[PDB]
Structure formats: C-alpha cells, structure tokens
Amino acid sequence: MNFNVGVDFPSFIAWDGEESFPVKVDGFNQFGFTFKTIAALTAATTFNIFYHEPSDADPCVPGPAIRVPEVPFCDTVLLSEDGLAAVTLPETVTPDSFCAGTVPCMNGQWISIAPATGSETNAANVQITVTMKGATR
Amino acid sequence: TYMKIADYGQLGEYTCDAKCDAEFGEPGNIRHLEGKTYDYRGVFCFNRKNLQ
Amino acid sequence: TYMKIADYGQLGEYTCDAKCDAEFGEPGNIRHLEGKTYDYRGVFCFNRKNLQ
Amino acid sequence: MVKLNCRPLCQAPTASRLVSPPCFICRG
C-alpha cells in the first residue's frame, strides 16, 4: 500500500557519473543526498559541492557554481584545511549499499556535485541523487 | 506545517434524462505545506577598562 | 406548458355616422409555449480501507 | 494504474497596465 510519495518528498538526478545537474531547492526547506556505488572503487572519492544563483537573464535558471563553505559543529577537528565543504566517499564500499549526506546551512537556489580532480575516474562508477522535504511554496 | 486546498474541481455534469448512469467528474487536490523559522544573533566586545 | 399573449385588437374605429355598418379590425393572437427541465447526475467511490 | 499529479517550479511576474478613462473629449 505505497502512497503517491512522488509528491511529498520527491527526488532528482544530481550526478549520473558523467555530468552534474543543478537542481532547484526553493520550493522546499530541507534536503539531503544519496550516494550509490555501481562498482567497487579503487580509492576514496572526493566531491566538491557547489550552489548556484538565478542567472540575471532568467530568474529561474542557475548561474555559475560558487563553492559552499564548510561548517564545523562541536567536535569537528578536521576542518578540511580549506573551509570549503566537500564529501569523500571512503574506499571499500560495497556496491549494494548507500550513504546519506547534507550541508546543514544552505545558500543560493541550486545544488551541484563535482568530483574533485584526481579522483574523477572512479566518479564514472558512482551515482548521486538528491531528495527534498516538505514544500514551502 | 499545514494544509492547503488547491482547487475543489468539478464534480458532476448536466446529463440527459432517461439514463441510469452517471460520471465520476474530477476530484480536487489537497496539498500539505510546511515552513521553518530563523535565527538572528550578534556579538560585541569591550575592554572593561573603558567600562569603568 | 404556459400561455403567451402576442398583441391585442384593432376594433374600435372612429368611422363616420352616416355608415350604419361597423367593422372588425384584427381580433388578436395568443400563443401556447412549452419547455422541459434538465438534470445533473454524478457518481464516485472510495477504497473502503484506503479511506478509513 | 499509475496516475500523475504534476506541478511547475518557476513563477513568472504578472504586470499589466492600469488604463483609465482619458481626458474628457466632446463629440464635435
């Protein structure tokens, strides 16, 4: 007895493994990511996060990709030495499982994920999707 | 969070007489929206020597 | 079915006095109208358990 | 039986002139 859960927390494709897709978030208030490995990797895979702004030409087309900073909570001591949030799927992840993730403070209108340089050939074997939460507008 | 009525929609029609039948029409739509709150904070320092 | 009136008559001439013979202008006309009434039918169900 | 219930995401402005009866003119 599954509901029409398309509406009431839909989702979109963020990273097919070959290219990213900026996705709007304004309609909702909360959101998170979902990572899926299609094959066994060879090293930890780092992905930088980026947010976009409505291009001045069209108020609902994403502009460039500004990199969102990193926010430490209470016991975070790593700080990623750059304060520019990025997420690294660790090596040895079984290709029948998933992992969650999110940024605690949003900024802009669109979200995009791009594999950090050097670890981009394993990105060809990963799929990242995004889910939202209840509707604001 | 709260509820909202998109539109009641049409529910019935002017059929002709002598027909033991009817139509289903169109149901409405009931969206369920939600919102968050926000914070607003500030700080300020001193020297405690000018405060005396 | 109901009753319409088209118009009234024309009899009533002011003819001269030497003429010992009156006339009949135009008696009149009444109509008889009809009309039906229309209906509105509709139907809808619910899934007994999915509604409860 | 699948059924869709779809909705847009980008709103557009709603601008419109507010024309009014112009300067009074005389038929002549």
Side-chain angles (χ1 to χ4, degrees):
Chain A
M1 201 182 56
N2 63 329
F3 304 148
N4 205 355
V5 285
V7 70
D8 285 306
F9 313 149
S11 85
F12 297 92
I13 296 185
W15 166 256
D16 75 323
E18 308 181 353
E19 64 182 1
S20 200
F21 305 92
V23 291
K24 210 159 182 175
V25 72
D26 196 84
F28 319 97
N29 57 345
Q30 313 190 40
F31 72 110
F33 261 117
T34 15
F35 328 124
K36 162 61 179 41
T37 176
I38 195 168
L41 319 175
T42 63
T45 56
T46 304
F47 283 73
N48 316 318
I49 319 180
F50 301 97
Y51 68 98
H52 306 246
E53 295 279 12
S55 297
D56 304 67
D58 182 1
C60 49
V61 62
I66 301 169
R67 180 164 172 166
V68 55
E70 169 182 4
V71 171
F73 294 97
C74 286
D75 56 277
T76 57
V77 197
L78 322 181
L79 278 301
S80 73
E81 86 253 9
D82 192 74
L84 267 186
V87 284
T88 302
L89 264 169
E91 183 54 21
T92 69
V93 284
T94 173
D96 66 332
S97 295
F98 47 88
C99 275
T102 192
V103 175
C105 278
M106 64 306 293
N107 44 357
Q109 300 296 322
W110 324 83
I111 295 292
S112 63
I113 309 296
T117 50
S119 170
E120 294 173 352
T121 180
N122 274 340
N125 304 327
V126 72
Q127 299 176 182
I128 317 180
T129 73
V130 59
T131 82
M132 288 66 54
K133 206 207 150 54
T136 67
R137 186 192 68 242
Chain B
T1 189
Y2 58 92
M3 323 295 307
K4 179 191 60 45
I5 294 94
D7 56 314
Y8 293 92
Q10 59 91 4
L11 275 84
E13 194 271 330
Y14 282 163
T15 63
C16 61
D17 207 311
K19 183 147 51 183
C20 303
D21 198 13
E23 275 305 320
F24 282 97
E26 175 61 38
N29 191 296
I30 306 170
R31 286 170 50 87
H32 181 88
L33 265 58
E34 67 164 75
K36 65 183 182 296
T37 64
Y38 315 95
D39 53 325
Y40 166 80
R41 324 159 87 172
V43 287
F44 45 92
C45 60
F46 276 126
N47 66 9
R48 209 175 311 175
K49 88 199 79 164
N50 279 329
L51 276 60
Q52 305 323 304
Chain C
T1 44
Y2 54 96
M3 301 293 185
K4 180 69 69 68
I5 294 192
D7 50 333
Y8 292 95
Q10 289 318 305
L11 67 166
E13 287 301 315
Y14 288 168
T15 187
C16 199
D17 208 311
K19 295 206 199 86
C20 200
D21 46 351
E23 205 179 0
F24 52 100
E26 181 42 51
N29 191 320
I30 64 154
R31 300 258 304 281
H32 181 272
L33 275 294
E34 307 198 7
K36 54 180 178 176
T37 178
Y38 313 94
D39 65 85
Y40 188 83
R41 275 178 158 258
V43 71
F44 55 89
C45 90
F46 288 113
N47 184 315
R48 179 55 267 154
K49 75 171 298 272
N50 194 27
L51 177 64
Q52 197 39 51
Chain D
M1 177 43 62
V2 302
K3 195 184 77 67
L4 294 171
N5 192 31
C6 199
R7 73 197 204 95
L9 301 174
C10 169
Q11 290 329 290
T14 45
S16 51
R17 313 199 311 167
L18 208 45
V19 303
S20 185
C23 47
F24 177 83
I25 314 297
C26 192
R27 290 194 251 259

